[PDB]
Design an enzyme around this catalytic site. Structure first.
Site, PDB file in Angstrom:
ATOM      1  N   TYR A 110       0.126  -0.553  -3.876  1.00 48.42           N
ATOM      2  CA  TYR A 110       0.966  -1.614  -3.325  1.00 48.42           C
ATOM      3  C   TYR A 110       0.754  -2.920  -4.107  1.00 48.42           C
ATOM      4  CZ  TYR A 110       1.782   1.325   0.867  1.00 48.42           C
ATOM      5  OH  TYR A 110       2.123   2.338   1.764  1.00 48.42           O
ATOM      6  N   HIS A 138      -4.235   9.778  -3.193  1.00 47.81           N
ATOM      7  CA  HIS A 138      -2.851   9.514  -2.862  1.00 47.81           C
ATOM      8  C   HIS A 138      -1.934  10.610  -3.426  1.00 47.81           C
ATOM      9  CE1 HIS A 138      -0.124   5.755  -1.975  1.00 47.81           C
ATOM     10  NE2 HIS A 138       0.193   6.813  -1.234  1.00 47.81           N
TER      11      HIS A 138
HETATM   12 NA    NA Z   1       4.174   7.769  -1.463  1.00 48.88          NA
END
Ligand code: NA
Length: 306
Positions: free
Chosen positions: A60, A118
């Site tokens: 992010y 992730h």
């Molecule tokens: Na994602």
């Protein structure tokens, strides 16, 4: 407030209601800092009742905003559950240990509550593979810097890669999951649940994102409206509770503090066995809608609603 109990006996709040990502991609430069994001995170922490479950990610680029909010809220640490994710697809740090060290420093906190790899697909430029990355997570578990450990966007086969080397079995796998995409990759939900790995579901509200023009005619959407009216709750609330009733942790975010409160408060009402099954069955009779990992996972579409 309701919790899931992971395979290790630890409690995780049954919905995650604040995200810490920008509606747009950011790097972190002071020029790109979003006051609006730090404001909503803090307002959420200040005003949302119970233990607030936050979902974040290295990718992010918003650890600054979250750090500022965490500082300036008077919500105590132990009434916050932070989920964070090492970026394996597109490298930002050298490996999980370095990523988390960076993250703790920026956030001004001592530990995260859940730490995920992730992506099962590792950037070539990483000097780590999946196996070695997991072992790093296991050390972060043992040093207490990650209270719980898991993965994200993993197939059955990718889980088997981890299970084959794991000392500590993964406790979570966060996937795309809605009533219109009920297995991100073949068999994932059945396998994970059979193995005592908690699924989190991101994009649970896909059906309300892409709501068609003749929805007043489609049984699925008619039914959702009917439940909304019965319970005096939003369609979104009904879907989030549906996810929970399917044994899964809905992951949601809003810009609107009132929607964030509503997501926390899904445990103000309940759904019957019949209602859960009907949302599933009306869902499954809908062609799959996949909103993420289209590049990677379109090939799995034929089995996503099977
Ligand atoms: Na994602």
């Amino acid at each position: 407030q309701k919790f899931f109990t992971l395979s290790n006996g630890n409690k995780i709040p049954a919905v995650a209601v604040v995200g810490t990502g920008t509606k747009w991609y950011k790097e972190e430069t002071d020029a790109t800092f979003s006051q609006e994001l730090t404001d909503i995170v803090k307002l959420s922490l200040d005003t949302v009742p119970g233990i607030v479950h936050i979902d974040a990610a290295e990718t992010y680029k918003t650890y600054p905003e979250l750090g500022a909010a965490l500082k300036e809220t008077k919500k105590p640490r132990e009434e916050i559950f932070i989920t964070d994710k090492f970026s394996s697809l597109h490298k930002i740090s050298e490996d999980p240990k370095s990523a988390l060290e960076t993250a703790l420093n920026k956030l001004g906190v001592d530990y995260v509550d859940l730490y995920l790899i992730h992506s099962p697909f590792f950037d070539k430029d990483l000097n780590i593979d999946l196996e070695t990355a997991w072992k790093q997570l296991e050390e972060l578990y043992k040093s207490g810097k990650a209270k719980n450990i898991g993965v994200s966007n993993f197939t059955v086969e990718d889980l088997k890669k981890v299970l084959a080397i794991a000392e500590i079995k993964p406790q979570v796998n966060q996937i795309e999951f809605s009533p219109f995409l009920q297995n991100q990759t073949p068999g994932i939900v059945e396998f994970s649940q059979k193995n005592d790995i908690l699924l989190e579901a991101y994009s649970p509200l896909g059906p309300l994102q892409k709501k068609p023009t003749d929805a007043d005619q489609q049984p699925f959407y008619q039914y959702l409206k009917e439940l909304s009216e019965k319970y005096n709750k939003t369609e979104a609330q009904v879907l989030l509770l549906w996810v929970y009733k399917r044994g899964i942790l809905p992951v949601t975010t809003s810009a609107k503090i009132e929607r964030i409160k509503q997501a926390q408060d899904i445990f103000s009402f309940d759904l019957t066995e019949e209602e859960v099954k009907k949302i599933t069955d009306l869902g499954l009779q809908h062609e799959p809608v996949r909103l993420y990992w289209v590049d990677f996972y379109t090939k799995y579409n034929s089995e996503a609603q099977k």
